[PDB]
Coordinates of N, CA and C (backbone and C1' of nucleotides) in Angstrom, one line a residue:
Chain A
X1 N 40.7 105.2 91.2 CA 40.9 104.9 89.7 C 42.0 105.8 89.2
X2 N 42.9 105.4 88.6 CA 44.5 106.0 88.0 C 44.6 105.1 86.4
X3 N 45.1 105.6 85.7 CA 46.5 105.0 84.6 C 47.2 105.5 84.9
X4 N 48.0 104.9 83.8 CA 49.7 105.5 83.8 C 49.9 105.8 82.4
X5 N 50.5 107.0 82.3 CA 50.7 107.6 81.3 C 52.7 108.5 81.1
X6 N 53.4 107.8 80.4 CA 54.1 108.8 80.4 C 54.4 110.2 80.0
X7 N 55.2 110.7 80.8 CA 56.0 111.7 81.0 C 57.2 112.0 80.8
X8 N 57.5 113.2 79.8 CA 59.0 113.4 79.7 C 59.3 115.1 80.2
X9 N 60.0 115.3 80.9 CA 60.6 116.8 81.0 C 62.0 116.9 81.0
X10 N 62.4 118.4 79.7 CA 63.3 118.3 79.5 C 63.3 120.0 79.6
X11 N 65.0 120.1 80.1 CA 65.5 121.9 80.7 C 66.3 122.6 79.7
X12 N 66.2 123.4 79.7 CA 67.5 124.3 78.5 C 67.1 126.1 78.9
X13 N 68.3 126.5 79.1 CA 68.3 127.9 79.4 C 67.8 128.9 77.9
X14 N 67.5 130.2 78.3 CA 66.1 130.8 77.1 C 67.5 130.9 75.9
X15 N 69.0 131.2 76.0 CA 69.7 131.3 74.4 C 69.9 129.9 74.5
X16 N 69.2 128.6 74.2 CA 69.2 127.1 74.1 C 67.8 127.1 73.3
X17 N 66.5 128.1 74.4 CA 65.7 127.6 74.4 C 65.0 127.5 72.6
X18 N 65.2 128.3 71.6 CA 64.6 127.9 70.2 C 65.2 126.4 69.6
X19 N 66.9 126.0 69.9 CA 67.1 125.1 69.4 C 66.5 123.8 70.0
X20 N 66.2 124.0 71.3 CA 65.6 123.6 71.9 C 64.4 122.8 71.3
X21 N 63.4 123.8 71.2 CA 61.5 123.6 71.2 C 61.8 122.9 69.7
X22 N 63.0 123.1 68.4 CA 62.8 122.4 67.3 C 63.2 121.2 67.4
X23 N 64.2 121.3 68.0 CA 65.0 119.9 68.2 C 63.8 118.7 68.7
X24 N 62.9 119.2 69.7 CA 61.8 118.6 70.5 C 60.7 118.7 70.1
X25 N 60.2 119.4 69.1 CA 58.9 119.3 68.4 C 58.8 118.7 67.3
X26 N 59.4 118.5 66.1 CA 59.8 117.8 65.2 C 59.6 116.6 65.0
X27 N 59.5 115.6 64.0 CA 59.2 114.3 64.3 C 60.5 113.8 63.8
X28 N 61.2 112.6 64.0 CA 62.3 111.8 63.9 C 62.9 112.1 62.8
X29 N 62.2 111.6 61.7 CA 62.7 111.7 60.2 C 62.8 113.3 59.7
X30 N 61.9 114.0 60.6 CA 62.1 115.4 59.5 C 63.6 115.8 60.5
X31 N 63.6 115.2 61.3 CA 64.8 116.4 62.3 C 66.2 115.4 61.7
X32 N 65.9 114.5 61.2 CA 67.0 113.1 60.9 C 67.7 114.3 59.4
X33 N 66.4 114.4 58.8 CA 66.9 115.1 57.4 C 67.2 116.6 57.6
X34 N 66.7 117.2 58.4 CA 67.0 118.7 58.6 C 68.9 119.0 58.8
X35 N 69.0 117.8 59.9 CA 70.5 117.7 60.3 C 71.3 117.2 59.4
X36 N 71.0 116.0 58.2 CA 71.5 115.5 57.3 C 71.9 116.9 56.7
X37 N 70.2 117.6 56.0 CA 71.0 118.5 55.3 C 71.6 119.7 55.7
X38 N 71.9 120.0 57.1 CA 72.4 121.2 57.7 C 73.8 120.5 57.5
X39 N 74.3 119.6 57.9 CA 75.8 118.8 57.5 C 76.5 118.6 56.4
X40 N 75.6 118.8 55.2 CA 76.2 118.0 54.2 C 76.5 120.0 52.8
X41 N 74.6 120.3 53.0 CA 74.9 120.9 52.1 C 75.7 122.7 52.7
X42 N 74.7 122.8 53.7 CA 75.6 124.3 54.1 C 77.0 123.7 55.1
X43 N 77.2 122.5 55.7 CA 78.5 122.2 56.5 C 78.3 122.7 57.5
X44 N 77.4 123.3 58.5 CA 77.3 123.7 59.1 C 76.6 122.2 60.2
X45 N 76.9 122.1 61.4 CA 76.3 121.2 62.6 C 75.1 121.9 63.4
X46 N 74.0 120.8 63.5 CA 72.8 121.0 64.1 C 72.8 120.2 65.0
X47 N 72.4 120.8 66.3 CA 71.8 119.8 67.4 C 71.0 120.3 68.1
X48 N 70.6 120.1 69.2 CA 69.5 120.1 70.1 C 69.9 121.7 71.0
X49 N 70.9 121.9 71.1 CA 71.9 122.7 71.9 C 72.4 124.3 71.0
X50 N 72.7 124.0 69.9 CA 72.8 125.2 68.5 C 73.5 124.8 67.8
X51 N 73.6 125.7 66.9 CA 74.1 125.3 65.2 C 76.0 125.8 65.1
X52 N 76.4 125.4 64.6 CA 77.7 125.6 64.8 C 78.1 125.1 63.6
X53 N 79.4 126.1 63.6 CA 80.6 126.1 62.3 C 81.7 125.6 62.5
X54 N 82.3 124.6 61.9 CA 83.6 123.7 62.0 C 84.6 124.8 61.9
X55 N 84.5 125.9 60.3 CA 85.5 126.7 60.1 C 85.7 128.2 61.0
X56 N 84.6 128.7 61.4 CA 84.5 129.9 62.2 C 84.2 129.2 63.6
X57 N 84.9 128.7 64.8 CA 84.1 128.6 66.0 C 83.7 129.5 67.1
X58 N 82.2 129.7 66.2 CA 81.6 131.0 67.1 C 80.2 129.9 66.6
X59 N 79.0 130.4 67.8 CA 78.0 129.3 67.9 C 76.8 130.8 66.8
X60 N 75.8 130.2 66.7 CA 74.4 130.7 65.8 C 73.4 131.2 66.5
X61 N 73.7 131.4 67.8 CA 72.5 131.3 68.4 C 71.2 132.0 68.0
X62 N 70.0 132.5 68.2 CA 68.8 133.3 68.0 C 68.1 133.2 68.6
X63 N 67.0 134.4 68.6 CA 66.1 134.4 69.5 C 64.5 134.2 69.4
X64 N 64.8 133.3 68.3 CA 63.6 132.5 67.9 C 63.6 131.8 66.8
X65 N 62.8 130.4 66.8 CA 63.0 129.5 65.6 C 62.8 130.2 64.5
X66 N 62.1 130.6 64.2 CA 62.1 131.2 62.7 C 63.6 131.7 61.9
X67 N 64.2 132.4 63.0 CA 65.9 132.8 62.3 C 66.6 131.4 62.1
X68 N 66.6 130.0 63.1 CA 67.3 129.1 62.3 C 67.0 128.4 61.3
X69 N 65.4 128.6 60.9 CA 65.2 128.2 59.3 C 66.2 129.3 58.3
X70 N 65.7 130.6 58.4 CA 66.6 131.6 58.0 C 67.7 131.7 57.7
X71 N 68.5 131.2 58.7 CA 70.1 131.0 58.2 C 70.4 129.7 57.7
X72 N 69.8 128.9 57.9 CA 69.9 127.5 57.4 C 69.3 128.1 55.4
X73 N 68.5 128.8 54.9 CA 68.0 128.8 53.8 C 67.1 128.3 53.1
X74 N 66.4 127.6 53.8 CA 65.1 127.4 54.0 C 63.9 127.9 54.1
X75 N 62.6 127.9 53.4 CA 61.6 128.3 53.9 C 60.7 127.8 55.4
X76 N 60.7 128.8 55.9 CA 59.8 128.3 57.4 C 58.6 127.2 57.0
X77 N 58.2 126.1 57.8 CA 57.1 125.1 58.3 C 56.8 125.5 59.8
X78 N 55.2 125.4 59.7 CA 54.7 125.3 61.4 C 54.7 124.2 61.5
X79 N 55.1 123.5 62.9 CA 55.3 122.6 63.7 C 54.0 121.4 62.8
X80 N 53.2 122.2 62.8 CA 51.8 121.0 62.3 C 52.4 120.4 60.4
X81 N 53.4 121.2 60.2 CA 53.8 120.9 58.7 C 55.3 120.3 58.5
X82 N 55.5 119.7 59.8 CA 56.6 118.8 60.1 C 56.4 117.4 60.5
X83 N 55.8 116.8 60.0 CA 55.0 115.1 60.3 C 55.8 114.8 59.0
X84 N 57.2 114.0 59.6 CA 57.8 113.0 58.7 C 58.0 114.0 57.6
Chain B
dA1 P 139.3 71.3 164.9 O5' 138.4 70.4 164.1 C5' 138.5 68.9 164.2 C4' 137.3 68.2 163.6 C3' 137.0 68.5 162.1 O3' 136.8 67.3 161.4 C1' 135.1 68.9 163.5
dA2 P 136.7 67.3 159.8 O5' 135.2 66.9 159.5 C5' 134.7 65.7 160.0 C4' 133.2 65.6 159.8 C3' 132.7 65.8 158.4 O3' 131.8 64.8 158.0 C1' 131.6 67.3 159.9
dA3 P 131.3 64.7 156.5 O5' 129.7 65.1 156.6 C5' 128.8 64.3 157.4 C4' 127.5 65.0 157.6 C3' 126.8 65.3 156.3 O3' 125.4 64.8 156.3 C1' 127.0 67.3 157.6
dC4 P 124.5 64.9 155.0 O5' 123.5 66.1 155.3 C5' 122.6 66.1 156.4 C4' 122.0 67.4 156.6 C3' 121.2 68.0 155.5 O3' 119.9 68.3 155.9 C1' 122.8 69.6 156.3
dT5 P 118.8 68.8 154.8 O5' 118.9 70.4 154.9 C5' 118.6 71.0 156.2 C4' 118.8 72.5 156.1 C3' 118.1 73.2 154.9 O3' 117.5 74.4 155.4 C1' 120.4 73.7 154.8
dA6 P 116.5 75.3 154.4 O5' 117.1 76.8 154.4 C5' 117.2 77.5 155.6 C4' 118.0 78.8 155.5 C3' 117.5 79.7 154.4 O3' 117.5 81.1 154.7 C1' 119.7 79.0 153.8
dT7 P 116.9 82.2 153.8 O5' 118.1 82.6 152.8 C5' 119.3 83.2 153.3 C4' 120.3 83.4 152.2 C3' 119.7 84.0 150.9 O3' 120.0 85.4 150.8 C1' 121.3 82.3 150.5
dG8 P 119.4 86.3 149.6 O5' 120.4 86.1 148.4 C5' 121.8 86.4 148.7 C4' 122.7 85.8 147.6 C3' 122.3 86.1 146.2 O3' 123.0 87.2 145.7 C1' 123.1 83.8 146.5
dC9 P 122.8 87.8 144.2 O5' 123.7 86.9 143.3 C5' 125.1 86.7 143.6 C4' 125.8 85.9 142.5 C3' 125.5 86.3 141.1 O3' 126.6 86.2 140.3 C1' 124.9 84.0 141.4
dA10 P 126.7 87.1 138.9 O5' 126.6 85.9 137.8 C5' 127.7 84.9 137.7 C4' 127.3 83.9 136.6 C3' 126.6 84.5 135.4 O3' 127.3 84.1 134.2 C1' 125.4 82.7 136.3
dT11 P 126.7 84.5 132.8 O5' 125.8 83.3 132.4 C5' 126.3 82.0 132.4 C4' 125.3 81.0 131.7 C3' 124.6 81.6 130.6 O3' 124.5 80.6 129.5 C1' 123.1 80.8 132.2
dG12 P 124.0 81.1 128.0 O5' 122.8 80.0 127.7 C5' 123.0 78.6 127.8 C4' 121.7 77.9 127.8 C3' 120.7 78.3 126.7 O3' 120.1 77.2 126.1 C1' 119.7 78.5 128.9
dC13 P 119.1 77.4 124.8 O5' 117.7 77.3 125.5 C5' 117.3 76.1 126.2 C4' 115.9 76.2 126.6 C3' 114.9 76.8 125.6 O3' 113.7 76.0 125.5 C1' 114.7 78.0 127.6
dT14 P 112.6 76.4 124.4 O5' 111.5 77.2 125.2 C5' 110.8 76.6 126.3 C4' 109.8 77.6 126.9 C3' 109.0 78.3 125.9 O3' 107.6 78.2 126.1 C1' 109.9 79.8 127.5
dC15 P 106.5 78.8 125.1 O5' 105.7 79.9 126.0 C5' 105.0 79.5 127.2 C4' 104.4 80.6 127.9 C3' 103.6 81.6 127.1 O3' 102.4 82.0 127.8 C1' 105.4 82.8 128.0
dT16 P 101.3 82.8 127.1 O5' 101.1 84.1 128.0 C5' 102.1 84.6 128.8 C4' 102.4 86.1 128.6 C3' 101.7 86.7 127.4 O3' 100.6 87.5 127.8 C1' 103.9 87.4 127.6
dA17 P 99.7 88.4 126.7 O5' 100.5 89.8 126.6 C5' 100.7 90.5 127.8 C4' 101.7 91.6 127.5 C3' 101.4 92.5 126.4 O3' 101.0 93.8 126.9 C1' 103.7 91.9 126.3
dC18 P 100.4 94.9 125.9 O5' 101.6 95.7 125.3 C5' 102.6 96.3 126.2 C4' 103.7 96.9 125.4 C3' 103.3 97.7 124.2 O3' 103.9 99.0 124.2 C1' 105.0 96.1 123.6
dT19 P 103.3 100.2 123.2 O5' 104.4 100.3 122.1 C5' 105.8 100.7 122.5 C4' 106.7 100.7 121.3 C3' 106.2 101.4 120.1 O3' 107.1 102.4 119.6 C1' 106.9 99.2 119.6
dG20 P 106.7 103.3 118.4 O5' 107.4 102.6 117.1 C5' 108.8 102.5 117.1 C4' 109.3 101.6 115.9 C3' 108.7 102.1 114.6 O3' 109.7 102.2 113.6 C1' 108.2 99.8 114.9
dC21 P 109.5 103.0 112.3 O5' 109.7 101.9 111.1 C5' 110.9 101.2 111.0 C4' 110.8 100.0 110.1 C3' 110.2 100.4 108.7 O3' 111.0 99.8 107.7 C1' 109.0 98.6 109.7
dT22 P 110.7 100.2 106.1 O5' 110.0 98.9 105.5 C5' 110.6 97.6 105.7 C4' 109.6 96.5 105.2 C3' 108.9 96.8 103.9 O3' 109.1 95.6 103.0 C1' 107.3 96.2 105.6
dT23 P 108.6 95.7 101.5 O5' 107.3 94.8 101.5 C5' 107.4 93.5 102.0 C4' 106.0 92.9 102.2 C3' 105.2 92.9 100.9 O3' 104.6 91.7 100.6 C1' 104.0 93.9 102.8
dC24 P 103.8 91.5 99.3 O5' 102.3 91.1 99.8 C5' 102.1 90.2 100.8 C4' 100.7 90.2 101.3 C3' 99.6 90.1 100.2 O3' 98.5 89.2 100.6 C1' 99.3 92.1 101.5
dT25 P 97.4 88.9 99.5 O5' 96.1 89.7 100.1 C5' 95.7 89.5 101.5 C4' 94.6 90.4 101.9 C3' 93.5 90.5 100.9 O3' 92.2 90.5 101.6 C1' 94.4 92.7 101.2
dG26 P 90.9 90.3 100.8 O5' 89.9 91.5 101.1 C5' 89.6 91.8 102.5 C4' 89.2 93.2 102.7 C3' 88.0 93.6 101.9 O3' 87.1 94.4 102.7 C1' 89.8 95.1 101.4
dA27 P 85.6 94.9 102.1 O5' 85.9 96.4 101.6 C5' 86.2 97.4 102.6 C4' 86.7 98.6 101.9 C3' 85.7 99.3 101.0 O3' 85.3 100.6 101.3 C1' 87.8 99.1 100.0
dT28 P 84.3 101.5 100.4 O5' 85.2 102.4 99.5 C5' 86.1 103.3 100.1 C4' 86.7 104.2 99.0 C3' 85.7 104.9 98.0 O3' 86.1 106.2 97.8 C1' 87.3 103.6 96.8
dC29 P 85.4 107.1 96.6 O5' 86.5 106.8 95.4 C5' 86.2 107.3 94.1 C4' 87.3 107.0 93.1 C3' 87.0 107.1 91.7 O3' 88.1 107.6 90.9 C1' 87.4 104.8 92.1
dT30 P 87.8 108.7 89.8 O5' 88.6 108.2 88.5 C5' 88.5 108.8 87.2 C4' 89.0 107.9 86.1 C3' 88.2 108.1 84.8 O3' 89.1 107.9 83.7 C1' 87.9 105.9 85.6
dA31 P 88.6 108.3 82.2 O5' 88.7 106.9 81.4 C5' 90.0 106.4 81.0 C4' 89.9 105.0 80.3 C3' 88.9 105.1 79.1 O3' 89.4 104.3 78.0 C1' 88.0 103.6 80.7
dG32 P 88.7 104.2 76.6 O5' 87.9 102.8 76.6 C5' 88.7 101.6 76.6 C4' 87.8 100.4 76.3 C3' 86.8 100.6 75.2 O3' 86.6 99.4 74.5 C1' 85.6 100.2 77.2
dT33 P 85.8 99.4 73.1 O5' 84.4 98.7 73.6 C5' 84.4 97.3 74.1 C4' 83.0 96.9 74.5 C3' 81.9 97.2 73.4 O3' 81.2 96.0 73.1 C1' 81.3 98.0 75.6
dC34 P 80.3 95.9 71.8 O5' 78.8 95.9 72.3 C5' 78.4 94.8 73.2 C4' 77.2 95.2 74.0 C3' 76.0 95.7 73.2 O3' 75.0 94.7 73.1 C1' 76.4 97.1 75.2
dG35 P 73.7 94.9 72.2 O5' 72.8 95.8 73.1 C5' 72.3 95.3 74.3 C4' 71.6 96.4 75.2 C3' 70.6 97.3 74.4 O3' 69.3 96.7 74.6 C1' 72.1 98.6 75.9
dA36 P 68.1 97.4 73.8 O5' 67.7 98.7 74.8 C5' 67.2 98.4 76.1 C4' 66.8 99.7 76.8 C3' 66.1 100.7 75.9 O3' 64.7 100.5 75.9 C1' 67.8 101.8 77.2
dC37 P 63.8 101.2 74.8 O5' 63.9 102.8 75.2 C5' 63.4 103.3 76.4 C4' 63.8 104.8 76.6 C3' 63.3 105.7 75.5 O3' 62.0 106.1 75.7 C1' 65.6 106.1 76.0
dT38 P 61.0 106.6 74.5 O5' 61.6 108.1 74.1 C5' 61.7 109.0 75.2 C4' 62.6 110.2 74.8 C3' 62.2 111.0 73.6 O3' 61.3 112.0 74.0 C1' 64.6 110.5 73.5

DNA sequence: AAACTATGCATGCTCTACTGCTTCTGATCTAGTCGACT
């Protein structure tokens, strides 16, 4: 007796690893809007990999999610307060 | 003394092979587009 259930695994080295765990915990729409508004209102680029500046190119890295809510301006959400 | 035949040379045509140069074809590879996923 078996099912089949998928499986996804994905790698990122530990200064990747916070942009990482948000980029991949998050659900579609909140990470859709997070990046809208990391683009539009601070100008600043978000992705899966780190946050970066068009005008200074030097990367944001940190060593834990809670600093890129922080520099983004934001108040922190736990993962369970990110559903859409 | 005369006729036949052995021996050789010069030349054109043809099969057969071999070496080298050039060109064509099969095989090994990056850009554009659509689509899948997360």
């Amino acid at each position: 007796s078996w099912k089949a259930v998928r499986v996804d695994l994905v790698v990122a080295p530990v200064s990747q690893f916070p942009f990482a765990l948000l980029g991949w915990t998050g659900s579609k729409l909140f990470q859709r809007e997070l990046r809208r508004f990391s683009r539009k209102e601070k100008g600043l680029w978000l992705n899966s990999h780190g946050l970066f500046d068009p005008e200074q190119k030097t990367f944001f890295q940190a060593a834990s999610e809670e600093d890129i809510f922080r520099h983004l301006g934001l108040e922190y959400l736990p993962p369970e307060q990110r559903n859409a």
